[PDB]
Structure formats: C-alpha cells, structure tokens
Curated annotation (Swiss-Prot), chains A, B, C, D:
Pathway: Lipid metabolism; mycolic acid biosynthesis. PANTHER family: ENOYL-[ACYL-CARRIER-PROTEIN] REDUCTASE, ENOYL-[ACYL-CARRIER-PROTEIN] REDUCTASE [NADH], CHLOROPLASTIC. NAD(+) binds at S19, I20, D63, V64, I94, G95, K164, I193. Many isoniazid- and ethionamide-resistant clinical isolates contain mutations within the inhA locus. Resistance to isoniazid and ethionamide can be conferred by the single substitution of alanine for serine 94; this drug resistance seems to be directly related to a perturbation in the hydrogen-bonding network that decreases the binding of NADH and the INH-NAD adduct. This is Enoyl-[acyl-carrier-protein] reductase [NADH]. GO terms for biological process: fatty acid biosynthetic process; response to antibiotic. Pfam families: adh_short_C2. Enoyl-ACP reductase of the type II fatty acid syntase (FAS-II) system, which is involved in the biosynthesis of mycolic acids, a major component of mycobacterial cell walls. Catalyzes the NADH-dependent reduction of the double bond of 2-trans-enoyl-[acyl-carrier protein], an essential step in the fatty acid elongation cycle of the FAS-II pathway. Shows preference for long-chain fatty acyl thioester substrates (>C16), and can also use 2-trans-enoyl-CoAs as alternative substrates. Is the primary target of the first-line antitubercular drug isoniazid (INH) and of the second-line drug ethionamide (ETH). Overexpressed inhA confers INH and ETH resistance to M.tuberculosis. The mechanism of isoniazid action against InhA is covalent attachment of the activated form of the drug to the nicotinamide ring of NAD and binding of the INH-NAD adduct to the active site of InhA. Similarly, the ETH-NAD adduct binds InhA. The record marks Y157 as: Transition state stabilizer. It catalyses: a 2,3-saturated acyl-[ACP] + NAD(+) = a (2E)-enoyl-[ACP] + NADH + H(+); a 2,3-saturated acyl-CoA + NAD(+) = a (2E)-enoyl-CoA + NADH + H(+).
Length: 268, 268, 268, 268
C-alpha cells in the first residue's frame, strides 16, 4: 500500500536524480503514488535522468513561463492518467532565480528582469500550476510547493528569499482557490539541501564570497536544528512532502511545514 | 501497515471520549500503535472511556502537576510496555485553564493562582512529560502537544491563549532537549473543537456573553479556513498528531503544525 | 522642536492629498523635516498636490522602473538639497498592482506581466530606492516603506499581498545594505486607508457579491483593532512613519511596524 | 519641548542603574516626562538607583505579586501625581526568572514554583499593572513592557523565554482592555543588554560556561543586527520605549517593537 496508495500525483521540478523533486517522486512511488512527472520543454532531458525512479511515470512538458504549456497541462495530464481520473497531488518543486539575483551579485545589483524571472518560476508558477491543475484535482487533493524559509534575510539567497517570501504569500492565495476544490495547498520549507546546484555554488561557481556565505548559512542549520540537519539528505524533506500529499494532514492548507530539522525554531 | 504501525505511544489527556486525546488515541490505534494511556483521579472513570477505544491500552496514573507521578512515569510506562521496549511517541493533549482565566471572565480578573495552575498543566507539563519520557523514547520518536494558535489575542480564550503561547515556547525548548534523544517535539495547533469543557464553554455555562464570543470565534474560523473548519470533528486534528507521531515529518521539531483548516493563514 | 527637525527626507508616492505619502510628507514637514518629493506619470497634478503641503519641497521625477531615473536620483536629490547635504530619510510609499492582480479579478487570472510590474513597483523598487539613495544618506538615517500585512491571505488584495510579502522580504535585505550606511530600513504595515487602490477596486462597488468580502475584510480592522481603526485617517500611519524617520526608533531595522490599530494582534 | 513632555509615566523594574528600566526613566525624564517609579523589597537600593535619574520622581511601593500593592497602586499613583492627574504612560520593566529556570540549570530542572514565580513577575504582572493603572491613564496613553524575542528557543534564557512568550500573549490581551481606555499596550523586544545580574548571570557569576554560552548567544546579535547591537548601551532600547510612550506610534498596540538592531530580521 504505502502512504500515497492509489494517489495520482504530478511532480514537477525533477532535473537530476538528486533533485528534491526526484526524491519526492521516489518516496511517492515507494508510497504507492502514481506519478506524472514534468520538466521544462525538456521532457526529453528529464527522460535520461529519471529512468531511476522505482516505477515508470508519464512525463510531460511544462515550462511554467509558457502560458500554452499551462493551458494544456490539464489536458495532457488527463490524457496521461486516464480520462475520468484526476490528480490527488501536485508537487511544485520548481525554484529558480537567475544567479544575478542570488549568489555573489550584491542584493542591490540584481536586475529586475532577472528577479522577475526568478519570481515567475519560483512563486508565480505555483499559482499557475494550481490554476492549471486544480480543475483536474480530486477533493482531499494536495498541492505542495517547496520553500526555504524567507522570514529572515540571509546572505547570498538574496532575491531567491524574496521569491520564497512571495511564494509563501502565493501559497495562502492558492489555498483559498484550492479549498473550493477540497484541495489543500502547502509549502514545505526545507533546510538547505546540497544538491547539484547548491554544491557548485559552495564549490565556488558563484564565487568564493557566496560559496562561503552559503556554507556558513548552511552549516548553521545543523547547529540550530534540535534534531540536526543533513544537507546531503533530501529524504526527510521528501517524506515531509509526501505527508502533505497524504491524507494525514487533512486540515492544513495555506501553510508551511518546516522540514528543516527545527532550525527555524531555534536562535542558536 | 498502519501509519503508526509498531509504534508505542503514550497518550495523555483523555478525560472524555470526545476530547482530541481520545481521537488521537483512536486514530493512533487504527494506525497500528500500541498505546499507553494516562489519566488522573477518576481512573476507573477514565478506563470506562478508554474502553471505547478500538484496542486495550494500559492506563497509567499521571497527575502531570505531580512526581511520585512524573518521576515514576518512565518506570511505570516501561513496566506497561515491557522490559526492552521504549516509546516512539508521547502525546500531550492536556489543556486546563481555570474558568477565571477562560472566556467567561475578564482577562484582568483571573487570579494568578488560577493562571499559574492553567500554565502548569497546559504548558509547563509539556516540558515535564518530555523530561519524564525522553529517557524511555526511541530515536526518531515524537512528542506532540496540543496547541491552539495564540499568536493573536482572542477574547473568551484569555489566559488559555497565554498558556498556549507559553506552550509554544516550551515546545521549542523541549525540542532542543528532545533532539538529544533523536526525538521530535511539536505542537498541533487545532482549530476550535467542541469537547465537554470547550463544549461546556458554548453550551450555556459561560453565559450569553462568553458563549457568543466563542461562537463568533468558531464561526469565523470556518469562514477563514480555505478548506473549512468543522467545530465538531476532532479527526483531522487526530490525524495530524498521528502524522507527527509518524516517520513522515522526520525533519520537523520545535514546531507547530496547524490542523485548523488553514484559518490562521487567512485574514478573512 | 518637531520630531524630524533638520532632517532631510525624500518622500515618494504622493499621487493624492489623501494618500499616506501626502500625510507623511505633511507630518514630516510639520515636524520640521525638509522634504524632497518624487513623482512620475502626472507630475503637474503631483505638483498641484504637493502644494497643499505646509512647505514647498522640490518634486524630482522618479519612475522607480527606470534604472536611469534611479542612477540619477542621488545627484538630483543632492542638487535639490545642496551639495554636501545628505538625506536623513527616505519614504517609499509607492505600491502598485495592475488590477488584474487586485479586487474583483481572480488571483489565478492576473497575467504574470502584471504581477511582475506590481512587484517591480511595490517591492523591488524599495531595493531600487535604497540603492539609489543610500550613497546620499546620513548615518542615523531611515528608509521606510509602506506595507500592508500580507502574513495572511485575504480576499481582493491578491497579488498586491504577494508584492507586500516580497516587499517585507525586500525590506530585510535592504536593512542589511542600509546598515552599512548606519541607515535603518523598515516598513509601516498600515491598516487599510481609502485612497485610489484600496478604494478604487473597493469603492463599495464592483458587485454586491465579492465587494462584500473586501468590505467585511476592511471593516474587520476597526473591529479587531483594540484602539480601533480609522480608514479615513492616514495621520496615525503618517505619524508612525515619522517615528521611524525620527531618531526614536534607533535600534529597529529590517523590520515592520504595524500602524493598524493593533488589528493584526487580534483574531476577533 | 521634549518627546514625552507633560507625560506622567510610571516606570517599574528599575533595579540597577545599568537597566533598560533605568534608562527608559532617564530618557523619559530627559524628554520631559514626569515619572512615577515603583520598587519592592530592596527599597533603599532602588531609591539610591533612582537618585541617579536626572529628575526626582516619587518611588511608590509595588510588589507586583501583591494584590494589595496592585489594588491600591492607582490611588498612590494619584496621590503622587496629584488628584485629577492621570498617567500617560506605564512602563513594565519587571523581568525575573529564578536561577533554576535560567542560564545553566537545565530547562528541565526548573521547579514549577520557580517558573510560576517568573511568569507571575515577568508576564502576568503586565496584566496586573495594566489593570491597576488603566483606570488612571489618559486616552492616548501607552503601556510598554519589555520583551526579549521568545519566538525561537535559545540557550540559557530557558523559562525566561517561556515567560517572554507568555508576556507577548499577555500584551495582546492587555491591548484589548487598554484600548477601551484609548490606551496602547506594546512590548519592546530588546536585544541582549548587559546589566548587574548580567555582570553576574553572564558576566562572572553563573559559571565559566554560562558567561560564554549566553555570550555566544548575545554576540550573535551584533553579528545579525544590520545596524549593529551594542550589548552595553540600553539607550536605543530606552528610546524605542519612549517612542512608544510618545504619540508618535498612535496606531500600534498589542504589538512588539524590536529594538534589537534588527537582529531578529536576519538569519546570519
């Protein structure tokens, strides 16, 4: 059976088999969910890099900045899951901020064009995935986005934090649209997960000054977290997203679940 | 198979079979948990109630304000669960504020003795129960208290709100103690549930003024909750506690999960 | 005498004489501030309106979306205030959301173009103005923007709420930059004031259907506010901004001061 | 002239001359306020300290744990300020947790009688004084308590933190009551300041480990604070308290002003 047994869940954001979305997809399939995966205009690129999930899953093209991809999402999901089936779950794990908005570009030097793209994909596309999929979501259904607690400013994250503040705000509005469908909308605020993107940042692609800043932020999590924080382990975070996809948090929406080791709840 | 399968879980606070504790225990059992219940005083009267549970559970005595109680709990639990066995969960679902500090009475008119007693039971006993039980908890274990979001003042909850503020703060310190045991500590902040004392609040014993203030409270909650809020139904709360008791929020502690229909995320 | 004696303060966002900006600027002047005003699209109507102010203040053009206006702002402000003088205060009271992102229009129907513009104006420009003006601010300086508590979703406000969420996040990052200059950055989270966007999609008229939600929403401030809320009266919010522009809140930055009658502290 | 000119302000909790409390009174007097002061057992030692204040103030006796002191205070305050004179401000700067609930003693080991006493003095007495004093406050008045951000758990502060959480809640409720008199109630959430029992309770009289763990705690402020935090300067806090005592924050109540260098707004 498993936690998500029977549930039809669309999972966006997988880019690598170390993506938070990939582990979310993984844990979901292990828990019996039936997935529909999405990846940007690169349904063929997500093809190479996800033949690694426990079960096969239809993969669909979605560039969330593409209003056509969005108008047709519901259409192709249905095609994918079977006419007469609906989604039980939607995982939005799409986050992106041009590195001009997050990494060593001064916070002030991030062009709005880039911030705006960061917010399009990171925050707004949450409302657009909700708009696209809510009509093909079952009551008791669950939308989950990925958050990184922006409630305090932090070095390097910069405009991405801004985008996550925006996303949290968007989440409470999604929940209110979502609740007309009996659907809940929540975010999972993850502690830092050193994946493909994060390790190059800390590896100094976005330079010494930002890698340092991220490293020192990211190391504060484990010190802070009463239960610690392994940034190399997406599983706790994937399991939390699946808890949100399950029927075990039936009265939470508009909300944020911290899967951060309890870091956010401790000063030091 | 069940969410909580193979979990040993202490549930405190079942005083009647409608109190969220009862529902927690019930769902916990339906999820495959082996319960140790606590009660104090009317212990033969509490076993009459816990007899209405799906499964037998040892009922131990525990006045949470007391020590031949608290200091002996771990021992008595260990005897109840057996040599070699530890608890995976602790549920604190004890809330008491003398009615002088409740909705009927002016905020300024609650004596400290009563406030103090209400905080002892509702907040400080959370630390007490963690102190008592942590030694006999398994890593990955989970302590959950019951919260009623006190971040905004509400009339006709008065000092109880204050007690829940205190609880929330206690929860975060407990988490930091619990983490040393690999153990989570969280609060489930429930929407308003009618019991036999929060029921006896609205039922008549509060008189017009406090009964109307509480109904205005509870009705706005349903309005606010994007997925709605059912005053009468403890299940969503009970499931949430169980989520928390499960392995599915392994990265959450010091924290609060709002099982409140999302009301706290919406202004109207 | 006067809170703001000797202080030079840039006030942006005066479009009207009822606008929070107008009253901030008036209060600042009554308090002995020397103002610089900025404005954009109807600059001669603006000059008419800034006349209704106790003292004349130069109006400089400033389209916050215009990077060249921004790049030139300090030098114009400086020529306006005389060389060797720097600003002590900056008021950002610019907030705008294309009404696709507000009022009667779905949250889901706002094109991103519109959300992006509103966030540009409402949130990003706060960092823009900080960037433009920090170089010409005195230590002990203050930058204040206008917030509307977006911590909880509400009907109508929609994408403007999201932009206010972004703005609060923007503000904390701006504080971090501003602090280098010994400058504070804070937001005043105002209760609702009727002017030309919390009253021109309001207006007690865009249907007797969902105009009702917003009416419920907005009359909830006065009712929630322990000291009440007067929607017609920008003075208390203007005074709050002035306190932040003063030296009387010298240890507060990256922060939000709620000038809302304490409504957001109260659930009902 | 003066910020608080004409203001009759009662200030409680002056117990050292290095206090936030002592500096609130000093700054209040420098700003024209006529003070009334209160103290309890160490009455010679308090009358000594308050002599260090630039102006004479009546010192009245007030054990906030004493319902006779409280039910009486208003009469004595009137006696000292003169019949038909009301207070315009009340400052609650009474904070005390017995040692077992603070610093080095585990959080777990604090007996409730200590916790209860700390909460009585630190939180409940905020409602006590408001109740004692609201009847003799002017509309336009202002009650201010001293907070220390308890939103996240930190080492050492322990049950003091819990007390602070409770106070924050108490304040929101005080605002309800107070708002019936035209009176605001707010807390100033100060950064760590080094007092007398902070040249003891972190200076050199808790241990070696409680003058380096509270020190490590407290020095993260100045790191985090965008405009910095001087542990030794209670003036920014005293001034913030006076802002709140002034008419410059007329729309804020039930609230918390963070005079903490903006530290709570920033993660690293």
């Amino acid at each position: 059976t498993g936690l998500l047994d029977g549930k039809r869940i669309l999972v966006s954001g997988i880019i690598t088999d170390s993506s938070i979305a990939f582990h979310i997809a993984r844990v979901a399939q292990e828990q019996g969910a039936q997935l529909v995966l999405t990846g940007f205009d690169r349904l063929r690129l997500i093809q190479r890099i996800t033949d690694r999930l426990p079960a096969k899953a239809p993969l669909l093209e979605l560039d969330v900045q593409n209003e056509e991809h969005l108008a047709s999402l519901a259409g192709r999901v249905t095609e994918a899951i079977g006419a007469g089936n609906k989604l039980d779950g939607v995982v939005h794990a799409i986050g992106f901020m041009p590195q001009t908005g997050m990494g060593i570009n001064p916070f002030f030097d991030a062009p709005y064009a880039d911030v705006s793209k960061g917010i399009h994909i990171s925050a707004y596309s949450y409302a657009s995935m909700a708009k696209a999929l809510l009509p093909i979501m079952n009551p008791g259904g669950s939308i989950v986005g990925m958050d990184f607690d922006p409630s305090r400013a932090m070095p390097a994250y910069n405009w991405m934090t801004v985008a996550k503040s925006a996303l949290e705000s968007v989440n409470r509005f999604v929940a209110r649209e979502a609740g007309k469908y009996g659907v809940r909308s929540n975010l999972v605020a993850a502690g830092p997960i050193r994946t493909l993107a994060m390790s190059a940042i800390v590896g100094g692609a976005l330079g010494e000054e930002a890698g340092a800043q991220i490293q020192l932020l990211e190391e504060g999590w484990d010190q802070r977290a009463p239960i610690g924080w392994n940034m190399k382990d997406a599983t706790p975070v994937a399991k939390t997203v699946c808890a949100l996809l399950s029927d075990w948090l039936p009265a939470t929406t508009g909300d944020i679940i911290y899967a951060d080791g309890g870091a956010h709840t401790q000063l030091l």
